[PDB]
Amino acid sequence: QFKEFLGTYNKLTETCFLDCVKDFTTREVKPEETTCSEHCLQKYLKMTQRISMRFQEYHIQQNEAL
Amino acid sequence: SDQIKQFKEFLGTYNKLTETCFLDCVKDFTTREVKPEETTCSEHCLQKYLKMTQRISMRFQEYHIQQNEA
Amino acid sequence: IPESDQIKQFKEFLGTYNKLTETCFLDCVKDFTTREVKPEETTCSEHCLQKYLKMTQRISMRFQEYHIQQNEALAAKA
Amino acid sequence: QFKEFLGTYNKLTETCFLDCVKDFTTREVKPEETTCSEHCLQKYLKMTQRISMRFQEYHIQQN
Amino acid sequence: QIKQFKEFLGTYNKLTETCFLDCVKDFTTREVKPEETTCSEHCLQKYLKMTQRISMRFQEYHIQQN
Amino acid sequence: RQQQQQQQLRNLRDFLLVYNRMTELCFQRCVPSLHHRALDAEEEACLHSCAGKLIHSNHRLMAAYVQLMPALVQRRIADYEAA
Amino acid sequence: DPLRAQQLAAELEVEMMADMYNRMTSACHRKCVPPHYKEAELSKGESVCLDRCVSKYLDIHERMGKKLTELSM
Amino acid sequence: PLRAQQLAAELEVEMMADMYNRMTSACHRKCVPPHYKEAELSKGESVCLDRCVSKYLDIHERMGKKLTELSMQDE
Amino acid sequence: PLRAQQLAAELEVEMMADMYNRMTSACHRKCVPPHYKEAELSKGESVCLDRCVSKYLDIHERMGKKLTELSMQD
Amino acid sequence: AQQLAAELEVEMMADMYNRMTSACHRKCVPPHYKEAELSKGESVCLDRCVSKYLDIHERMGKKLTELSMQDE
Amino acid sequence: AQQLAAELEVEMMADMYNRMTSACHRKCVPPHYKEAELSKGESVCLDRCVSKYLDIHERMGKKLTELSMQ
Amino acid sequence: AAELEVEMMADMYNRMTSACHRKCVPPHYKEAELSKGESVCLDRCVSKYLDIHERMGKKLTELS
Amino acid sequence: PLQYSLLLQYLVGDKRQPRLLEPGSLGGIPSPAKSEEQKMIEKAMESCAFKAALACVGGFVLGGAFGVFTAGGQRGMSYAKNFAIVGAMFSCTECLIESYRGTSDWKNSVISGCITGGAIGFRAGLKAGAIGCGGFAAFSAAIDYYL
Amino acid sequence: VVAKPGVWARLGSWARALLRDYAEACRDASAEARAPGRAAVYVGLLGGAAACFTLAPSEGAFEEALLEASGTLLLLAPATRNRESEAFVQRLLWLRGRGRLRYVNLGLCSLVYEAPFDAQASLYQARCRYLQPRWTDFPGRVLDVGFVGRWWVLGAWMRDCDINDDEFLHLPAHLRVVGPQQLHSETNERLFDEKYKPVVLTDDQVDQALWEEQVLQKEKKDR
Amino acid sequence: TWGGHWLYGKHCDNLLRRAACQEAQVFGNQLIPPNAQVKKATVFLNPAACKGKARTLFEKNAAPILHLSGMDVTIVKTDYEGQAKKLLELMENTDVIIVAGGDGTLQEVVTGVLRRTDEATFSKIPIGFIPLGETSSLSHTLFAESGNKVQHITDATLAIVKGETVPLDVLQIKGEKEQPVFAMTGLRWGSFRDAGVKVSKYWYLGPLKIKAAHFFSTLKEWPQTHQASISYTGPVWKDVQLSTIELSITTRNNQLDPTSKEDFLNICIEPDTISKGDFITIGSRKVRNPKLHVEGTECLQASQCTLLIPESFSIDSEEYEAMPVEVKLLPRKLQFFCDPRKREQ
Ligand SMILES: CCCCCCCC/C=C\CCCCCCCC(=O)O[C@H](COC(=O)CCCCCCC/C=C/CCCCCCCC)COP(=O)(O)OCCN
Incomplete structure (x- = not known):
């Protein structure tokens, strides 16, 4: 669990950074970067939630067909 | 004598298979020969029905034993 | 003992008699507006009967032909 | 001696799936995607076999 | 020991692939060309400088942080 | 006694036959789609209805049949006597 | 000899009568108590057919008896 | 007496066989199509059969009970 | 395998009777609609049976072969 | 023994979960990141990616255990 | 067994470190290799990479712990 | 230690596998088996990969 | 040990031996004992060659009576032979159609009627059959309700 | 002669x-x-x-199609099943349990209409010529038609069974469009792969001047 | 232009049939226990009642509505009249009775019923009426006035299902030798009766028969007057001898529906001065509306009377041999079925 949590937390920083940084002349980030950081998070999380839901559904189904 | 009645049940279900697969997938009453496109149904229907019956019996015994313990 | 050999035939005749009455009744009778049996609803029954009998006859004839043919083939395989 | 096998299983599933199916219009796989899966399985297996052979071809000269 | 060897081996087998596919393009013969040997040398030096730089900056951050 | 035992045994037999037939029929026409593995209200209502209706039907038919049959068996034995 | 055989015939008659009762139930139900399944009590048109089907089935079970006693004399 | 219980058990067994031979045929016409293009049970069937059986027996017991009580209140 | 052949005789007569009944019912279901205007069988309904019997016995033998095959593969 | 098989299975399930996540994110979700909520078409594409991937996974596992004794 | 969690955490910190190294390498270390001389613009782009990645890392840790407790 | 080197070599093999997969064959998958133009893929991939691996371990042990 | 793979062979298999059965040992109603010389008689009576000949002679007599009625000769003979020809064609046609489809339904009659009408029209003129089909089809359709 | x-x-x-x-x-x-x-x-x-x-025969085609769409719908979870489709199919299957379903094969078409009673019923409440449905209401009691090949309604209601538009109402209007370009997964792959691109450097001089001034400011603060 | 109206009428009649059958269905889908018993019925039908065009009319327009209403409806067919009388004498117990046809078969049935030697309980059996005849006398005081030909009969037979009831009075007239004879509306004796009788004989011309029956009956002789004596009584036995063209002894027509105090017969003695001219024009109307009288006639109220005629009259459109008779009223002796709207009145 904790491992899953930290792993997704590390993956998500990576993806969101790699996704929403297109200015590399400066030292500091503009608020748009914060807007991304806040949107990427919730979106990725809803995504992972739906995926886990469908996976658990399939799992109990396959466990119900023995 | 028990094995004998077992084989009798076997023959009974075999007649049942015959009739069922027949009624289900034998339609064109034009020629006197088994159409090649429906003599494969038979082959399928046979094992389909066998597996169906096995699954049914499995669930039936599972349920009856779930009851017997309680 | 030898009565059983014919008892079974008689009992099967009764069984098919009931099993056939049921069918002729299901197919012919369609008018429950009178406790009396209309004329159509009994000639239809007689026809159901005679047709079933003539069908069974043809069935047995063809089956016996098939069986003797297959048995001749088997005996010739020897 | 068995974990690597399931690793290859997962990896080749990922490869075949990612490289053929691109419609997502219907929930059920089309026959074309079944052909994809078959061909991808066969090709990846032949590739792995050849990889193993050419890799033992390194140990024959290294040992 | 091993607490510091894993990272070295990882660097090694990562630079292997990260440089094997930058300049090794022509596939007709069974031997490397000097354009690939010097290429790999530059890969080595540049990647090592890059990694040591990244580590130095990470430590600099951690210092300026606490 | 053994005669009465055989008779009550036969009665139990046809009773259970009716029970089986009733199960089969009420399930064949009060359970169209099985998507949930569990029985819901409307289907339980269909069951209550089918069962009560069928039992009442059977009572009525037994009454009428026991009214009539004696005449028919009497006709049967009379024709046999004539033969 | 014919006494014992006549007895067995009466036994078979009882069995036939039970079989016919069961088939009558089946048919007179399938034929005039159709599936609406909203009330457990019988309606009126039904309670009438249920009384007619019997007298209309027993006439056939007898006509057919005469006919088959003729043919399979 | 012994023969009585023997025959009672035999008859219960025969009735169980009847119910089995009715349940198989009822679930067949409700889960299995006549398609028979395949030759082995798919998922849809292997599920619908379990679900038909987990319902037919429920009905069986429910009707047994309601029927015995209805026949008792009748008389 | 001799007592086997005796048992075979017995089960053979029995199963043949059963199959005769099944075939009667099935050929009735398929080759004879419920009209019953006249007694004499129509022309088509007199050949449809000669076609049902054979299409049924061939089925029977095919199932027998396939079933022996599956059984030996226990 | 049993514990080893359990660890094997749970590990090979976590791996496929991660991989299916990566994929269905590769294929359905676009990288725009302007509204912190999913659309409908993509919330469908996700379910369909999962179903298809699982079907393929079972199918390939079967067709590959086939080639476990047939390759002997 | 909390020190076990702590060494897990430092392992995850190391994995994040390597991930970000690879990320910035792909981001602003073009695939030319014509000169092993690490360029100045890239020399500072690396600083920017690390700084921004760590800023986002801590912001996400904060916001996500807030989400979880929520 | 040496077993760690063994699993290291295993990971390196697993790595080169995908390293050459894309280089050799495109994502067409129209045919269910290798052509000849690609039958020379791997005897070249692995050869050059191992050459580079060794010549790189050389420069790595250099500083060691 | 029953060895199901072997009892099946003895029951259904080339290893089976000949069997001597009785007609009545199986089946509800024992088929009445029948002479082995009448079954071919019925086969001939039902075979639609006989029915086609019946239609031939019936249409012959019909055309004869029609020519007898219309005059009040020679035209009667032509009408008789023509009616006989068309009837012998129609009967055998519908018989073959039925024996093919196996079912007795109005489709057979309408098809045979359209066939005869189109054939006659084409013998006279192709454009004529295109309407003789529909004409005789409606005729043989209404004949069923008159039947 | x-x-x-x-x-x-x-x-x-x-x-x-x-x-x-x-x-x-x-x-x-x-x-x-x-x-x-x-x-x-x-x-x-x-x-x-x-x-x-190639006309659609009910006896096989409709039974198979219905009894297969039911199987397709079983597997799905109650959270993802288009309510209307499930209801339509439960209807068609609650009739067929009775005998309400009829069938007819034309020469170029084939229909499936429902009756208010089964076919074995011999009541008078069902046989009365003055209670049977009117001619003009037949099209109002037809269910599924097979034009040339398969059935052209079952498929239409079975086309989007998985999608359930009930819980998608927390959204503005411009999130409900599900046009197909959003499912054919070709562009998304490109957009995803084009996330790691060697970034260009053009302002190296002014950027480094700014970094130098920044370290000078840091030095000033240290003092 | 002409056939179209015919088709439209057929359509509307089918519509009405369908609607009434729906209502009857509503009356038939009603629950009942199994031990309970159903309300039986017995139908007497004279096929040759209107013109022989009754069998079909009844089988089409009312039989359904009897079969849907949930009642064991046994149908009988009266070949001739004595058949009906004997049958009804040997009839068993039931719950209702129904009669399809003109007042003739109705009178025959009421005779067979109340003549029943041993039953004053049949007078409790609610009978029903169905006017298959072109014209009826009761229908005016028992049903809706009229719509089409079929709406009347449909509503009438539907009132039976409705399960209403109405007490009605009859009158018994005794032949000194012949068995008694009962009737609901009344008897008539004289010229107009002969006219109404002979109109059928003159079937060659439809327009003139409605008047030429009377016309030609005049050309035999105008003074078709006949005399007889009566001894009547009030609701003490005073006699009156008199000669007329026609005499009608009938029941009331208005106060049968509402409540009042008196229970009295109604009589109508006719003068004999009318001219042939006024005779034709008035008989032509009377044959279609026998309720009215010619003019200024005498209609005194009574309860019981007796007729002494010097050496053939009709009772509710049924011919009978004339003789001296004793006539008496039975008040509210029978129970019929009325539309509920009329019951409200
Ligand atoms: C525009 C005004 C002019 C009118 C012209 C006539 C047009 C006719 C169109 C059809 C009318 C609909 C009525 C159909 C018949 C109703 C009869 C009925 O009751 O239906 C079935 C009979 O079944 C049928 O045969 C159905 C009728 C099918 C009609 C086939 C005609 C084909 C015409 C297709 C029209 C499409 C228009 C498109 C034009 C295309 C041209 C390029 C009854 O079955 P039962 O066994 O009684 O079961 C009920 C138990 N309670």
Whole structure:
């Protein structure tokens, strides 16, 4: 669990950074970067939630067909 | 004598298979020969029905034993 | 003992008699507006009967032909 | 001696799936995607076999 | 020991692939060309400088942080 | 006694036959789609209805049949006597 | 000899009568108590057919008896 | 007496066989199509059969009970 | 395998009777609609049976072969 | 023994979960990141990616255990 | 067994470190290799990479712990 | 230690596998088996990969 | 040990031996004992060659009576032979159609009627059959309700 | 014998006349070909015959299609099943449990309508000619039609069974469009792969001047 | 232009049939226990009642509505009249009775019923009426006035299902020798009766028969007057001898529906001065509306009377041999079925 949590937390920083940084002349980030950081998070999380839901559904189904 | 009645049940279900697969997938009453496109149904229907019956019996015994313990 | 050999035939005749009455009744009778049996609803029954009998006859004839043919083939395989 | 096998299983599933199916219009796989899966399985297996052979071809000269 | 060897081996087998596919393009013969040997040398030096730089900056951050 | 035992045994037999037939029929026409593995209200209502209706039907038919049959068996034995 | 055989015939008659009762139930139900399944009590048109089907089935079970006693004399 | 219980058990067994031979045929016409293009049970069937059986027996017991009580209140 | 052949005789007569009944019912279901205007069988309904019997016995033998095959593969 | 098989299975399930996540994110979700909520078409594409991937996974596992004794 | 969690955490910190190294390498270390001389613009782009990645890392840790407790 | 080197070599093999997969064959998958133009893929991939691996371990042990 | 793979062979298999059965040992109603010389008689009576000949002679007599009625000769003979020809064609046609489809339904009659009408029209003129089909089809359709 | 030979000669003359008529018909067909309308007529007739040949039979086709769509719907979870489709199919299957379903095969089509009672019913409440449904209401009691091949309604309601638009109402209007470009996964792959691109450097001089001034500021603060 | 109206009428009649059958269905889908018993019925039908065009009319327009209403409806067919009388004498117990036809078969049935030697309980059996005849006398005081030909009969037979009831009075007239004879509306004796009788004989011309029956009956002789004596009584036995063209002894027509105090017969003695001219024009109307009287006639109220005629009259459109008779009223002796709207009145 904790491992899953930290792993997704590390993956998500990576993806969101790699996704929403297109200015590399400066030292500091503009608020748009914060807007991304806040949107990427919730979106990725809803995504992972739906995926886990469908996976658990399939799992109990396959466990119900023995 | 028990094995004998077992084989009798076997023959009974075999007649049942015959009739069922027949009624289900034998339609064109034009020629006197088994159409090649429906003599494969038979082959399928046979094992389909066998597996169906096995699954049914499995669930039936599972349920009856779930009851017997309680 | 030898009565059983014919008892079974008689009992099967009764069984098919009931099993056939049921069918002729299901197919012919369609008018429950009178406790009396209309004329159509009994000639239809007689026809159901005679047709079933003539069908069974043809069935047995063809089956016996098939069986003797297959048995001749088997005996010739020897 | 068995974990690597399931690793290859997962990896080749990922490869075949990612490289053929691109419609997502219907929930059920089309026959074309079944052909994809078959061909991808066969090709990846032949590739792995050849990889193993050419890799033992390194140990024959290294040992 | 091993607490510091894993990272070295990882660097090694990562630079292997990260440089094997930058300049090794022509596939007709069974031997490397000097354009690939010097290429790999530059890969080595540049990647090592890059990694040591990244580590130095990470430590600099951690210092300026606490 | 053994005669009465055989008779009550036969009665139990046809009773259970009716029970089986009733199960089969009420399930064949009060359970169209099985998507949930569990029985819901409307289907339980269909069951209550089918069962009560069928039992009442059977009572009525037994009454009428026991009214009539004696005449028919009497006709049967009379024709046999004539033969 | 014919006494014992006549007895067995009466036994078979009882069995036939039970079989016919069961088939009558089946048919007179399938034929005039159709599936609406909203009330457990019988309606009126039904309670009438249920009384007619019997007298209309027993006439056939007898006509057919005469006919088959003729043919399979 | 012994023969009585023997025959009672035999008859219960025969009735169980009847119910089995009715349940198989009822679930067949409700889960299995006549398609028979395949030759082995798919998922849809292997599920619908379990679900038909987990319902037919429920009905069986429910009707047994309601029927015995209805026949008792009748008389 | 001799007592086997005796048992075979017995089960053979029995199963043949059963199959005769099944075939009667099935050929009735398929080759004879419920009209019953006249007694004499129509022309088509007199050949449809000669076609049902054979299409049924061939089925029977095919199932027998396939079933022996599956059984030996226990 | 049993514990080893359990660890094997749970590990090979976590791996496929991660991989299916990566994929269905590769294929359905676009990288725009302007509204912190999913659309409908993509919330469908996700379910369909999962179903298809699982079907393929079972199918390939079967067709590959086939080639476990047939390759002997 | 909390020190076990702590060494897990430092392992995850190391994995994040390597991930970000690879990320910035792909981001602003073009695939030319014509000169092993690490360029100045890239020399500072690396600083920017690390700084921004760590800023986002801590912001996400904060916001996500807030989400979880929520 | 040496077993760690063994699993290291295993990971390196697993790595080169995908390293050459894309280089050799495109994502067409129209045919269910290798052509000849690609039958020379791997005897070249692995050869050059191992050459580079060794010549790189050389420069790595250099500083060691 | 029953060895199901072997009892099946003895029951259904080339290893089976000949069997001597009785007609009545199986089946509800024992088929009445029948002479082995009448079954071919019925086969001939039902075979639609006989029915086609019946239609031939019936249409012959019909055309004869029609020519007898219309005059009040020679035209009667032509009408008789023509009616006989068309009837012998129609009967055998519908018989073959039925024996093919196996079912007795109005489709057979309408098809045979359209066939005869189109054939006659084409013998006279192709454009004529295109309407003789529909004409005789409606005729043989209404004949069923008159039947 | 001479009379029989004469009759045979007359039959031969009639056969010759029939052959001449056939030749005239062939010439007329050639003239029609010289003048393509006849080709269009032949094409229309071939299409009609093809439709009649591959027409949808209820007994097998409808049973199979219904009993297969039911299976498809079983697997899905109650959270993802288009309510209307499930209801329509439960309807069609609650009738078929009874005998309410009827079927008819035309020459180019085939329908499936429902009756208010089964076919074995011999009541008078069902047989009365003055309670049966009116002619004009037949189309109002038809369910599924097979035009040429398979059934053209079952599929239509079974096309989007998985999607459930009930819980997608927490959204503005411009999130409900599900046009197909959003499912064919070709562009998304490109956009995802084009996330790691070597970034260009153009302002190195001014950027480094800013970094230098920044370290000078840091130095000033240290003092 | 002409056939279209015919088709439209057929359509509307089918519509009405369908609607009434729906209502009857509503009355038939009603629950009942199994031990309970159903309300039986017995139908007497004279096929040759209107013109022989009754069998079909009844089988079409009312039989359904009897079969849907949930009642064991046994149908009988009266070949001739004595058949009906004997049958009804040997009839068993039931719950209702129904009669399809003109007042003739109705009178025959009421005779067979109340003549029943041993039953004053049949007078409790609610009978029903169905006017298959072109014209009826009761229908005016028992049903809706009229719509089409079929709406009347439909509503009438539907009132039976409705399960209403109405007490009605009859009158018994005794032949000194012949068995008694009962009737609901009344008897008539004289010229107008002969006219109404002979109109059928003059079937060659439809327009003139409605008047020429009377016309030609005049050309035999105008003074078709006949005399007889009566001894009547009030609701003490005073006699009156008199000669007329026609005499009608009938029941009331208005106060049968509402409540009042008196229970009295109604009589109508006719003068004999009318001219042939006024005779034709008035008989032509009377044959279609026998309720009215010619003019200024005498209609005194009574309860019981007796007729002494010097050496053939009709009772509710049924011919009978004339003789001296004793006539008496039975008040509210029978129970019929009325539309509920009329019951409200
Ligand atoms: C525009 C005004 C002019 C009118 C012209 C006539 C048009 C006719 C169109 C059809 C009318 C609909 C009525 C159909 C018949 C109703 C009869 C009925 O009751 O239905 C079935 C009979 O079944 C049928 O045969 C159905 C009728 C199918 C009609 C087929 C005609 C084909 C015409 C297709 C029209 C499409 C229009 C498109 C034009 C295309 C041209 C390029 C009864 O079955 P039962 O066994 O009684 O079961 C009920 C138990 N309670």
